[PDB]
Every structure is written in structure tokens, then in C-alpha cells.
Amino acid sequence: SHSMRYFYTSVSRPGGEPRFISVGYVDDTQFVRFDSDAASPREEPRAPWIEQEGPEYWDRNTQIYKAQAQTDRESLRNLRGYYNQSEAGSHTLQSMYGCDVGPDGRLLRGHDQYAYDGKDYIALNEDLRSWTAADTAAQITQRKWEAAREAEQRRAYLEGECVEWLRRYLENGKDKLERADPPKTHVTHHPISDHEATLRCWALGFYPAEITLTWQRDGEDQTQDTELVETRPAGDRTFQKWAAVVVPSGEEQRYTCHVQHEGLPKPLTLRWE
């Protein structure tokens, strides 16, 4: 099971074209980027394996980004109109689309969704045939896209070109994208007071990012009493996470951290301090 996903952000400025930034992921590996802030904006690589691509790739993609940026600038004006907002005032349009493929290599699911100024705006349903609008203004866009049979075109992209690009990228970097790097785990203790102590369970250098850390008090899972920090980037394409629990002092040894992850032969259990 694998995925490709593009993430677009457009931020219109008071006075100046909008800034358009795009990032491309395969699985949890950022592999391309584009920023409209350069004087010669180019699609640039951020994975080693996209580097096998010749100059035509980069040239063509740059053309598409600049065009998307252009569209987004207009979409942005249109939206100011829909919500009756003055032209004065920065706004944000975010876009996310991609395809998930099976171990097969065929489409599991397609994604195609938008958000304006933080809130959900419009999205493509799972049939890849209909639209879901968040407010009455997004229904303007909905009518427009239905009349223009837009669903057919996105379904076409999602089922076809998306998957083929993905299939290729997975070939190009098989080693890096098919290994699972399992967490280097351990536990730290903190005597925070006389009557309580903090047991914090670490997970370091893992890939991909999906993991579970759960504390258990005698095989009972302490779901609600645990601080779980959002999985964070190491800076080298791997992830760190930690889960911590505040336990009575003296009743420490009844607690165990359970680590689950794909790169792990079998679920770990740890304790101590």
C-alpha cells in the first residue's frame, strides 16, 4: 500500500502576485517542491531518487506549476467575490490531491479537496463522481464544476496518470521507499515530586511516520492519562515521537509502554527507572 500526494498553498498579498508553494510526497517522503518566490521558479528535488529524472521532467513540471499558480490567483479573486470580501486582505487557498494504490498497484482511493481561509471548501467524494460543498458559496463552484463534467476529468487523472507516476517513482527509489526503519526505543523517568513521577517512552529514527505508543497499567491501557506528542520530523527523513504518563510514586513498576510499527518484527514492551 502506497500513495502520492500533492499539497498546494496559495496566499494572496495586499499589494504583488500570490505566493504559491507546492510540495510533493510519496508515502511520507517529500520528493519535490516549488516556490513562486524565486526569480526563476523551478520544480526542485528533495529526494535523492527523483534525481534520475532528466531536464524535460523539471521543465515541464515548472510550466504546470506556474499555470496552477495562475489558476489559484484567479480562484482566489473569485472567492473574494463569493464571500463579499474587499480585495484588501490576504487570503489562503489550500489544495490536496493524490492517489493511494494497493500492493496490487491499482487505485485504492483518490483524493481531491480544497480549503479556503482555513475552513473546508469543497471536496471530491469517494466514488470520484460527485462533490461535497461546505457552504452555500462553495455550491457556486459545485454547480460550475458539475455543469462542466469536471468529476470525469479528475477521476480520469486519479485512476490513470496519478498511479503511473506513482508506480514509476516507487521503481526509481525502491530501497528507500520499501524498507521500514523501526524505532530505536527506550524509557526515561522523572521524579517530579514526592508523590508522583513521569515515565516517558521514546521512539526515535523511525520511518514511515505511523506508529502507536500506549502506556499500560497491568495490561490496562491508560488512554486518557497519557501525553502523546505529535509525531515530529528528525530532519533526516525519519520521525520521533514520545508518550508520557504521570504515575503515583512507588507504583511505577506496574506500567509498560507498548510500541507498534511496520519496521518492527513484533510489538515491543518496555519499562524502568
Binding site: 506549476y65 496552477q68 489558476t71 469543497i122 460550475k144
Partner: peptide, 9 residues
Amino acid sequence: SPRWYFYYL
């Protein structure tokens, strides 16, 4: 690669 389909909102 990015999708060569742009749609106006």
C-alpha cells in the same frame, strides 16, 4: 508529477 488539469473555483 503535478496534474496538468487546473480548474477555476
